[PDB]
Amino acid sequence: AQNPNCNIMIFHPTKEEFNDFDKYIAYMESQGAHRAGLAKIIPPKEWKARETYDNISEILIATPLQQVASGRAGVFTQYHKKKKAMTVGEYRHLANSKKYQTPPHQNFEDLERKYWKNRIYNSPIYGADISGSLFDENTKQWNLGHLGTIQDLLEKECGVVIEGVNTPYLYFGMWKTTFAWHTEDMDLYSINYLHLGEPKTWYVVPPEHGQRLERLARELFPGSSRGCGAFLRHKVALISPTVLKENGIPFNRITQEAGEFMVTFPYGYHAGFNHGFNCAEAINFATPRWIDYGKMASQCSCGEARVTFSMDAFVRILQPERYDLWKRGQD
């Protein structure tokens, strides 16, 4: 078996290899990349997402989210407090202000130490889940707005035609902005391109060990666990690498820099934080290997994790037995 220790693999495709997206994902998996839950892809030196990022300041962040923490440094939840709209230019200025800017640090490891020591004592503001794309329409390779759709994948694999669409989301981050432990909707893949700015550090649990993380989460957030059989779907729980190690949870870490892609694989739990002002673009996608994960994906039915229009059809077709109870949480 390839990659038995479930290490995060890093790929350097040639421009020729960068033409066929599906084929390269399949290649990565043939090398065992999916066992880690996360892979890095460094694009060919000839490739660019777009010409410049000089004219992005007038993008609107309609609902910036202030991420307020509760708990202890290594085991906490965050809730999102809605703030007034601001442009990306205004957001960048805020990110760089004395209150929010990245502190002096020696290296990525030093900054990681500072993050887990001090994150809960601050409330950074995130521009998340903004529908849109920063890929030039003339960028033909690995353009996250031009991928084959999950709906068409389901149709190709299973022969059923369904409603729904599948578009990218932009994320504007600052120091300490945080993404909680989660797998994707319906345990889909995700692909994430860091367009511009400071790095993003990722943590990931191998898919074959996802249930170990779930068990620890139930122990660490016992009230949440009683309230919902899949509360990590709420995307609000954080557990530090120190606490993961103390509890023997297998995981890996890696830092993504501007110009690099990350792919998360089905049922690969991940979490992380931004180093400073940045912009990422991400979208879910599927492959034939995803279908069995989609069938088995655990759902939030307590209702906290609202399920999108498009995910309705996934549950309806792949999980017909759960559909009724699960749609009540939606309604």
Ligand X SMILES: Cc1nc2ccccc2c(=O)[nH]1
Ligand Y SMILES: O=C(O)CNC(=O)C(=O)O
Residues making up the annotated binding site are: 126, 182, 184, 192, 200, 228, 234-235, 270, 300, 302
The binder of 302, among Ni ion, Zn ion, ligand X, none, by C-beta within 5 to 8 A per type, is Zn ion
Per-residue binding letters, 251-270, with ligand X (x by CB under 6 A): xxx-----------------
- CA distances to 53, 75, 135 from 259, rounded to whole Å, are 12, 31, 12
Q: Least distance to Ni ion from the beta carbon of 270, Å?
A: 6
Q: How many residues does the chain have?
A: 331
Quick check: 71 and 120 in contact, CB under 8 A?
Answer: yes
- Our CB check for ligand X shows the closer of 111 and 307 to be 111
The binder of 50, among Ni ion, ligand Y, ligand X, none, by C-beta within 5 to 8 A per type, is none
Quick check: 204 and 210 in contact, CB under 8 A?
Answer: no
- Our CB check for ligand X shows the closer of 110 and 324 to be 110
Q: What gap in Å lies between CA 30 and CA 3, rounded to an integer?
A: 10
Name the packing angle between helices 320-330 and 309-318 (round to 10°). Answer: 150
Which span sits near ligand X by CB under 6 A: 17-25, 81-89, 245-253, 304-312? Answer: 245-253
Residue 245 binds ligand X (CB under 6 A): yes
Q: What gap in Å lies between CA 168 and CA 11, rounded to an integer?
A: 23
Binding-site residue set for Zn(2+): 228, 234, 300, 302
* Binding residue (CB under 6 A) for ligand Y from 220, 282, 300, 318: 282
* Binding residue (CB under 6 A) for ligand Y from 24, 179, 231, 265: 179
Residue 280 binds ligand Y (CB under 6 A): yes
Number of residues that bind ligand X (CB under 6 A): 5
User: Which helix (DSSP H) or strand (DSSP E) does residue 19 occupy?
Assistant: none
Quick check: 197 and 276 in contact, CB under 8 A?
Answer: yes
Residue ranges binding Zn ion (CB under 5 A):
228, 300, 302, 304
Residues 50, 52, 54, CA angle at the centre, nearest 5°? 140
Those residues with Cβ within 8 angstroms of residue 217's Cβ, 6 or more apart along the chain or in another chain: 181, 225, 231, 232, 237, 239
Q: Least distance to ligand Y from the beta carbon of 239, Å?
A: 15
* Binding residue (CB under 6 A) for ligand Y from 67, 151, 192, 299: 192
Binding-site residue set for Fe cation: 182, 184, 270
* Binding residue (CB under 6 A) for ligand Y from 76, 91, 171, 172: 171
Distance of CA 243 to the CA centre of its chain: 21
User: Which helix (DSSP H) or strand (DSSP E) does residue 138 occupy?
Assistant: none
Quick check: 307 and 235 in contact, CB under 8 A?
Answer: no
Q: Least distance to ligand Y from the beta carbon of 71, Å?
A: 20
Residues of the shown chain interacting with ligand Y in the complex, contacts defined by CB under 6 A: 171, 179, 190, 192, 264, 280, 282
